[PDB]
Amino acid sequence: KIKNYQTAPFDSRFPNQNQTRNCWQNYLDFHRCEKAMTAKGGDVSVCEWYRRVYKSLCPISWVSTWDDRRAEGTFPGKI
Amino acid sequence: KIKNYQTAPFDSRFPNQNQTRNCWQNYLDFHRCEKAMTAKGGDVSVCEWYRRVYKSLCPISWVSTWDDRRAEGTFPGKI
Amino acid sequence: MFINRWLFSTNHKDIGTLYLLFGAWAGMVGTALSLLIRAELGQPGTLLGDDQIYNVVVTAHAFVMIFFMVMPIMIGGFGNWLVPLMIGAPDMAFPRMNNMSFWLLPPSFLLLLASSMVEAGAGTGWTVYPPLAGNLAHAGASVDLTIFSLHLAGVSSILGAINFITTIINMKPPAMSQYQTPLFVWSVMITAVLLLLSLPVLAAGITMLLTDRNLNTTFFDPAGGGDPILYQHLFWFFGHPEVYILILPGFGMISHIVTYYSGKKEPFGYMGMVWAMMSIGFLGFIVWAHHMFTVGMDVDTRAYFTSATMIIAIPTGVKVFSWLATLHGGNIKWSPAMMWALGFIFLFTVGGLTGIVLANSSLDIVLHDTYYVVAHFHYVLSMGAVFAIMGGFVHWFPLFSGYTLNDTWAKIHFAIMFVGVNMTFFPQHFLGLSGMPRRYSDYPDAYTMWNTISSMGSFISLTAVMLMVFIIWEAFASKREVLTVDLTTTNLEWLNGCPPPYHTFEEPTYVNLK
Amino acid sequence: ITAKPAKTPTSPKEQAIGLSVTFLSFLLPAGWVLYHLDNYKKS
Amino acid sequence: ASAAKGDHGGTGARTWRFLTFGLALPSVALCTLNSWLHSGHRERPAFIPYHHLRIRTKPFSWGDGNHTFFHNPRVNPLPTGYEK
Amino acid sequence: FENRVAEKQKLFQEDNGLPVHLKGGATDNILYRVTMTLCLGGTLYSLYCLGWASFPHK
Amino acid sequence: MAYPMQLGFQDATSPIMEELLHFHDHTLMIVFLISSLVLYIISLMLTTKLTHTSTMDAQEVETIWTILPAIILILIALPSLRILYMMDEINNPSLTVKTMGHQWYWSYEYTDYEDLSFDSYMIPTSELKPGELRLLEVDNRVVLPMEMTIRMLVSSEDVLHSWAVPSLGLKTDAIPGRLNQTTLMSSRPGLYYGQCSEICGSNHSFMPIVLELVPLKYFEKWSASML
Amino acid sequence: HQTHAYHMVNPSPWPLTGALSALLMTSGLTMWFHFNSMTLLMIGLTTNMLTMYQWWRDVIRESTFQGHHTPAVQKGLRYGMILFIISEVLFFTGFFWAFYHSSLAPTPELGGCWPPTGIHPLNPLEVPLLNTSVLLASGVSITWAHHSLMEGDRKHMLQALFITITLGVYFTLLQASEYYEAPFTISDGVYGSTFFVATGFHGLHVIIGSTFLIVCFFRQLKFHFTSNHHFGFEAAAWYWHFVDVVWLFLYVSIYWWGS
Amino acid sequence: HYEEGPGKNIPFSVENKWRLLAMMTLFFGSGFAAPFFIVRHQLLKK
Ligand SMILES: CCCCCCCCCCCCCCCCCC(=O)OCC(COC(=O)CCCCCCCCCCCCCCCCC)OC(=O)CCCCCCCCCCCCCCCCC
Ligand code: HEA
Ligand code: HEA
Ligand SMILES: CCCCCC/C=C/CCCCCCCCCC(=O)O[C@H](COC(=O)CCCCCCCCCCCCCCC)COP(=O)(O)OC[C@@H](O)CO
Ligand SMILES: CCCCCC/C=C\CCCCCCCCCC(=O)O[C@H](COC(=O)CCCCCCCCCCCCCCC)COP(=O)(O)OC[C@@H](O)CO
Ligand SMILES: CCCCCCCCCCO[C@@H]1O[C@H](CO)[C@@H](O[C@H]2O[C@H](CO)[C@@H](O)[C@H](O)[C@H]2O)[C@H](O)[C@H]1O
Ligand SMILES: CCCCCCCCCCO[C@@H]1O[C@H](CO)[C@@H](O[C@H]2O[C@H](CO)[C@@H](O)[C@H](O)[C@H]2O)[C@H](O)[C@H]1O
Ligand SMILES: C[C@H](CCC(=O)O)[C@H]1CC[C@H]2[C@@H]3[C@H](O)C[C@@H]4C[C@H](O)CC[C@]4(C)[C@H]3C[C@H](O)[C@]12C
Ligand SMILES: C[C@H](CCC(=O)O)[C@H]1CC[C@H]2[C@@H]3[C@H](O)C[C@@H]4C[C@H](O)CC[C@]4(C)[C@H]3C[C@H](O)[C@]12C
Ligand code: CUA
Ligand SMILES: [O-][O-]
Ligand SMILES: [Cu+2]
Ligand SMILES: [Mg+2]
Ligand code: NA
Ligand code: NA
């Protein structure tokens, strides 16, 4: 929808070797957006940028663990 | 999801006598949401809650000034 | 009387003798471990086992060499024997606490031994990084015994530091200022300040590892919000000062030996030597993260640590050139101690220079955790700290014992050791540049030739160690009693004869103020 | 340095004994363990 | 920088006793009153088995291995929640 | 209380050859022997525990 | 990879590794010079019967032995820091690949589009095919496009490891709970080897890295083949 | 036979018994953590207390009763105590470093925030503030005690020292109660880890410092101190101010800023 | 008081050079041998 996505671009908020927070922020951003587009009457397609970025950057086991905890009700970030 | 909106409810983020940041944050949130929707195609109607809250709380002259500065390119908050 | 004298001592000389005996015994243990290392690597394949037994050996090798051989010999041994004599003092400030610094060390060593006998040992590296050193990857008592071993060694050295600083500040003749005390006394004072400040941070860090392993803290465990990298900061905030602690008393001994056998009354540029040691001590506290250039730190931080590390070359070079300038114009006595000290100056310089190579964080990416680092620190330790130890031992053995060594045998010993250490460690530069990692029990086939040569060198150094033992025996066997030495006017520790009486300076020296 | 003549001089023969004993005391126990390495990795 | 007094003719025991009884112990008394006002127990919160809390990587060396050293049943839940 | 420091000064300066840790009299010897016996016995016991913990057990 | 009797660095496979080679040459020349001057001066001090044993004034000569080393240090630090900031520059990659360290093997994830992941284990010596390299081969190599800027993200699922490829100038520690980034660019196709570079237990010596660098079209063919 | 002023100490067994006590306490902690047994640890704690008791008893014999503490000897002990306190400051610095490291960069496991999700900190205006007033007050009362001693006033020295000790005990009982009431534990992630290990080592030093003050109290009851010579009292006061300053740093850092 | 002078300021006797040789051999030899026997212990344990 403004795509041709290849991989996550440089993000001036996360310019250093430690990219942990970049994965974390985009995972939060995707799921906050996805929740907003459900509870208020919209389309998750608007959330797609964050989805591609976090999927590109985040270890699969981090994503999997975070998803399990969101389902368990123990995810400690705010969504 | 469903209205019956009367006025802005108590917000634990802003529990004290100074409500300036409550007005400011809901103004930012509305216009951030708006920008996100208008781009990816979707509907500004999902932004409606923030619009009602900032309209309830914010002095007209603040909204008017902030709107002028966004049009001018001099709005100092991040949207 | 034997128990009163040797278990209940309050005498700086006897306590120094205990440290020297302890450190010599520890040197045998550390030498045996080093040979087991080089036997594993002496041909391609596996000799002993996988990396666990191998790295229990490596870990123990480093702890024994550093905490039980170098520091007890230099600081407990030469420091206790020489510092009071060199300032005319009748003993140390806290003569009874001094004995406890000594007797904490056999228990510390016993705890290290126990760590290697229970379970599968602590195969962690002497750095003991979590999570490998945590209770999932190193379950059981071994790592905890290692932590406790360090705690006791740490208390030993902290109390010893308090003793040396107090003695050196408070117990000089009233006319002697700090700028009239000998350079070896300065070197022990500065070493003691570094120990006082650095060991408590290590103690904090290893205590947090103990509680992560046993009380369900998560200082270093990301599941609790902890960070393995925090441990590394705490460890290296101690561990860089620690290598200056290992070399500074050596610098002080080298200054005395080079002065003496150049026939000089004084080292060249005394105040510059004091300045340089103080500068090295200070800069040694602000460079620790050069042990961490590959952990993911921001580029500006890597730049700062590159720069601050390299600046230590400036005061160190002042000392090297001042030793050369002390030789300059001397009536050179080619004694065995002089040979140790000359080998020190050159080989310490090579090792310091490869340290400056590693300070460059860009090149350190490729050199970190390879044998280039191993080559760097064995040049400053096996050919610096150890050469200063051997030079001071041969130089002062007649003072401590009252007997002379056979100089020809001591020169042979130097010659064997010089060949052995250089054959052992010089090829390790090639192994490092070409990418052989540290802490490996086996290596890709291309690395065979230099590992084979390095292991052959390690056996030559073994022959030197064995010969030393024989040389010490021969001296005590023949009983040539010292009569006089030269240069006593600028070497006060000799002026009460060999060995000095149990109590010296009961009547203090007379020193006036003109 | 100057020194009195040796109180109990150690002849070249005595030195050969002391040297040999010293070297053997290092070599024989380690040698025995290393010789039997295979015997250990199988028990 | 906020204080407001005088005192220094020359300092001694009488002055430090004056400070002890006239300032220091009254401050303790007042903080003791403040504390014995805001005492009384907060509404204990719903249990959520967060994975960064109630850490258990090895059993504690006392009791059943699963209770902290100063465990308070009223306010310290176990990894499985509050006790009965 | 009364100041009896002078009588302790006389006791601990008595020329009887005793080291300071024993100069208080027979109580000192008892406390020393208790301390040293616990230390040496405890140390022997720690060595037994090493031997036990050094081999697969339990 | 290293070869028998090698003395120096593996041949550079990336531009940054070439820069490091030239910087090492520069610094090693200085190391050799200073080492040899100190050795020479030692021999000079020791080879004359002339003596001078009275007090010598030190002030003048210590200006020279502080200023000259200071200048040398600056001449090392200038190119050293240039290369440092070069490595750090924004480069926008066309591909992100993750690697996770384990006891004792590496896994790889290519999740830009497809959700591809696999494990990469050392080939035991008893299984090497003839002519393959002891301790260095893996069953599944890191297939990558040559001549392109690649973002590698490194972490661990257990203890510390470190992901290294010496001929690309790469070594990035693998730390659980942390996602470390490095940039990879190979000038050439081929096979590029490295080894775990943080002690990690029993088989630290035996969990190598093998990159397989191929043209983009061949990388795309390989990716497409994994659907 | 000496004509210097320094102290040649009688040969002593307490260094050896102290070092053996360290062996027994550490191997005893190992036995407690890994082989379900407190026996060695209890022996080590007992021999450590016996060692400290007899060693410092002998220092009192050597000084109050035998006269070996000349001004030069006293000056050495002043340096020794300052250096010891410095080493203890650096020990605490390591725990503050851990605290700021974790709290300034909270990881995703915490919620990416500080305090972590699910942590409910104590109110720093309740018992922690009271504890702060208690230790500050005790710094005032110990200064009154010091001046009374210097002015030769036995009664007010004893009163002021007793008040100082009472406040140290009050702090310790308040902290024990706060530990019991705290809804978070040492196992509650890095928040609980930094909180309990740092304030716990501090509480240990309060108990040590209070014990030292109690030793001084009984030595004062026995007239050991002169109005000019009382270094054990000075050392205990320095150590007590150190304990007070560490508390202030804990209060501002962990209880207040980290809440 | 204690004995003083060469060979008297040490916790071991040098009165007889062959007894001394045995002592020094046991002393340094035991330290050098210990790591080999610990390695054998770990190898034999399991
Ligand atoms: C006492 C003896 C004991 C026996 C043990 C050995 C002792 C060490 C003595 C050995 C005598 C050393 C003399 C200089 C050695 C340089 C060897 C070399 O070719 O090095 C090459 C480089 C990398 O080079 C390359 O990438 C390309 C190499 C190929 C060039 C093209 C020619 C192709 C054929 C190559 C033929 C070989 C060339 C050598 C040409 C030879 C030129 C000298 O490797 C390196 O960086 C390794 C550098 C290690 C860092 C320390 C350097 C400062 C030491 C100066 C004093 C030495 C102290 C020795 C330690 C003390 C020594 C006394
Ligand atoms: C005696 C011990 C000792 C000493 C003195 C030193 C001294 C120095 N060390 Fe080293 N070092 C160790 C023991 C020591 N080191 C150990 C044990 C490790 C590894 C720990 C581990 O991982 O286990 C290590 C690791 C280590 C690293 C980490 C490498 C890695 O792990 O990737 C670095 C990086 O900067 C470093 C640098 C230096 C420097 C710059 C000096 C400088 O102080 C040297 C200064 C001296 C000179 C420069 C030579 C004399 C000077 C002149 C003749 C003047 C002219 C010279 C110039 C102008 C350059 N050392
Ligand atoms: C003081 C420190 C010191 C000394 C002297 C040595 C000495 C030696 N070391 Fe040491 N080594 C370390 C400290 C030291 N080492 C450290 C810190 C590490 C890293 C550990 C880790 O990675 O965690 C290490 C790692 C290390 C490795 C790498 C292991 C690996 O990465 O897998 C190797 C391999 O060859 C090695 C070999 C040797 C050899 C052959 C010697 C030989 O030169 C030894 C020869 C013998 C002597 C030098 C004699 C010693 C005895 C005395 C001086 C007593 C004299 C007696 C009297 C005066 C009475 N060492
Ligand atoms: C429930 C009970 C739990 C107990 C657990 C054990 C802990 C308790 C330790 C408490 C410390 C008590 C110290 C008592 C010292 C008494 C001896 C003394 O004070 O000795 C004085 C000298 O001081 C000196 O040695 C100065 C000596 C300084 C000693 C400092 C002690 C601090 C110890 C800290 C150790 C633990 C570290 C924490 C772990 C991380 C004697 O000199 P004066 O006073 O001038 O007298 C002479 C005049 O009379 C002449 O006119
Ligand atoms: C994990 C578990 C680890 C357990 C480890 C336990 C380790 C050791 C067991 C310790 C047993 C201690 C027994 C009492 C020691 C008292 C020493 C003391 O008080 O030493 C004094 C000097 O130190 C001074 O003052 C300076 C002030 C006194 C210093 C007292 C320090 C005690 C040691 C505590 C550990 C400190 C670690 C610090 C850093 C974290 C007196 O020195 P002396 O030479 O005696 O006399 C001199 C005569 O002139 C006195 O009349
Ligand atoms: C890395 C440091 C180690 C250095 C290397 C030591 C150098 C060699 C020392 C000699 O050691 C001896 O070698 C014998 C073999 O020559 C062994 O006898 C063994 O072999 C004999 C012949 O096969 C048998 O008669 C014996 O029973 C059997 O014990 C013996 O045990 C061992 O003590
Ligand atoms: C330098 C010192 C290093 C020390 C490191 C280890 C410290 C603790 C070692 C363990 O001590 C042993 O542990 C057993 C287990 O807790 C005890 O009970 C044991 O007693 C009998 C021994 O078989 C049986 O009843 C049981 O197996 C068992 O409970 C046994 O008495 C005791 O000595
Ligand atoms: C390494 C240490 C952080 C340790 C931590 O993670 O616990 C941090 C804390 C403060 C930092 C320093 C301060 O930020 C000040 C400097 C800032 C410069 O950009 C780098 C050097 C500089 C000197 C920093 C180096 C390094 O990153 C420091 C020392
Ligand atoms: C001033 C001080 C002591 C002089 C004295 O009182 O004897 C001397 C001793 C060592 C000297 C320093 C060293 O010689 C090293 C540097 C030499 C340079 O020539 C000047 C700065 C330099 C850093 C010197 C400054 C100053 O002259 C020092 C610090
Ligand atoms: Cu994985 Cu080393
Ligand atoms: O540490 O160099
Ligand atoms: Cu360093
Ligand atoms: Mg590393
Ligand atoms: Na091998
Ligand atoms: Na006073």
mmCIF file of all heavy atoms in Angstrom, chain E residues 20-31:
data_model
loop_
_atom_site.group_PDB
_atom_site.id
_atom_site.type_symbol
_atom_site.label_atom_id
_atom_site.label_comp_id
_atom_site.label_asym_id
_atom_site.label_seq_id
_atom_site.Cartn_x
_atom_site.Cartn_y
_atom_site.Cartn_z
ATOM 1 N N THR E 20 20.366 17.335 69.135
ATOM 2 C CA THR E 20 19.795 15.989 69.297
ATOM 3 C C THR E 20 18.350 16.064 69.796
ATOM 4 O O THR E 20 17.434 15.477 69.195
ATOM 5 C CB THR E 20 20.643 15.178 70.282
ATOM 6 O OG1 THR E 20 21.961 14.991 69.741
ATOM 7 C CG2 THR E 20 19.975 13.815 70.575
ATOM 8 N N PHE E 21 18.116 16.806 70.873
ATOM 9 C CA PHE E 21 16.770 16.859 71.435
ATOM 10 C C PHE E 21 15.870 17.905 70.798
ATOM 11 O O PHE E 21 14.640 17.771 70.890
ATOM 12 C CB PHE E 21 16.832 17.126 72.951
ATOM 13 C CG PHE E 21 17.454 15.987 73.747
ATOM 14 C CD1 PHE E 21 18.421 16.233 74.684
ATOM 15 C CD2 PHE E 21 17.059 14.679 73.544
ATOM 16 C CE1 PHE E 21 19.001 15.184 75.433
ATOM 17 C CE2 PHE E 21 17.630 13.636 74.282
ATOM 18 C CZ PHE E 21 18.615 13.907 75.234
ATOM 19 N N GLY E 22 16.430 18.944 70.179
ATOM 20 C CA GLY E 22 15.591 20.045 69.716
ATOM 21 C C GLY E 22 15.239 19.889 68.243
ATOM 22 O O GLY E 22 14.292 20.509 67.758
ATOM 23 N N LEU E 23 16.026 19.103 67.506
ATOM 24 C CA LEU E 23 15.762 18.927 66.071
ATOM 25 C C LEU E 23 15.648 17.452 65.668
ATOM 26 O O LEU E 23 14.717 17.042 64.953
ATOM 27 C CB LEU E 23 16.879 19.582 65.242
ATOM 28 C CG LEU E 23 16.900 19.318 63.726
ATOM 29 C CD1 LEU E 23 15.659 19.895 63.076
ATOM 30 C CD2 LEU E 23 18.169 19.824 63.020
ATOM 31 N N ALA E 24 16.644 16.658 66.068
ATOM 32 C CA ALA E 24 16.800 15.311 65.526
ATOM 33 C C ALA E 24 15.712 14.386 66.048
ATOM 34 O O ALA E 24 14.964 13.787 65.260
ATOM 35 C CB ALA E 24 18.185 14.755 65.875
ATOM 36 N N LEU E 25 15.571 14.301 67.364
ATOM 37 C CA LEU E 25 14.548 13.425 67.922
ATOM 38 C C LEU E 25 13.136 13.940 67.623
ATOM 39 O O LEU E 25 12.251 13.123 67.293
ATOM 40 C CB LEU E 25 14.790 13.229 69.424
ATOM 41 C CG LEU E 25 16.077 12.394 69.700
ATOM 42 C CD1 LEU E 25 16.190 12.059 71.171
ATOM 43 C CD2 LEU E 25 16.126 11.074 68.890
ATOM 44 N N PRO E 26 12.868 15.263 67.649
ATOM 45 C CA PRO E 26 11.543 15.702 67.150
ATOM 46 C C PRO E 26 11.256 15.267 65.711
ATOM 47 O O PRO E 26 10.120 14.845 65.417
ATOM 48 C CB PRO E 26 11.584 17.235 67.307
ATOM 49 C CG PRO E 26 12.500 17.462 68.600
ATOM 50 C CD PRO E 26 13.624 16.367 68.298
ATOM 51 N N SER E 27 12.249 15.320 64.811
ATOM 52 C CA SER E 27 12.043 14.850 63.437
ATOM 53 C C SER E 27 11.674 13.380 63.401
ATOM 54 O O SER E 27 10.793 12.980 62.628
ATOM 55 C CB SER E 27 13.290 15.070 62.588
ATOM 56 O OG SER E 27 13.536 16.462 62.450
ATOM 57 N N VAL E 28 12.363 12.558 64.200
ATOM 58 C CA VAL E 28 12.018 11.142 64.312
ATOM 59 C C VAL E 28 10.597 10.974 64.837
ATOM 60 O O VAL E 28 9.833 10.142 64.332
ATOM 61 C CB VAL E 28 13.046 10.422 65.200
ATOM 62 C CG1 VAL E 28 12.632 8.975 65.458
ATOM 63 C CG2 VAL E 28 14.428 10.465 64.489
ATOM 64 N N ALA E 29 10.224 11.747 65.859
ATOM 65 C CA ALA E 29 8.861 11.678 66.392
ATOM 66 C C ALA E 29 7.843 11.973 65.313
ATOM 67 O O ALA E 29 6.814 11.294 65.208
ATOM 68 C CB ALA E 29 8.674 12.672 67.552
ATOM 69 N N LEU E 30 8.101 13.007 64.513
ATOM 70 C CA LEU E 30 7.138 13.407 63.494
ATOM 71 C C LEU E 30 7.055 12.371 62.387
ATOM 72 O O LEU E 30 5.958 12.055 61.900
ATOM 73 C CB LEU E 30 7.520 14.762 62.907
ATOM 74 C CG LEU E 30 7.265 15.948 63.830
ATOM 75 C CD1 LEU E 30 8.029 17.162 63.344
ATOM 76 C CD2 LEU E 30 5.792 16.229 63.887
ATOM 77 N N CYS E 31 8.204 11.847 61.955
ATOM 78 C CA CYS E 31 8.163 10.782 60.954
ATOM 79 C C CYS E 31 7.522 9.525 61.525
ATOM 80 O O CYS E 31 6.896 8.758 60.780
ATOM 81 C CB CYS E 31 9.573 10.483 60.425
ATOM 82 S SG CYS E 31 10.260 11.795 59.374
#
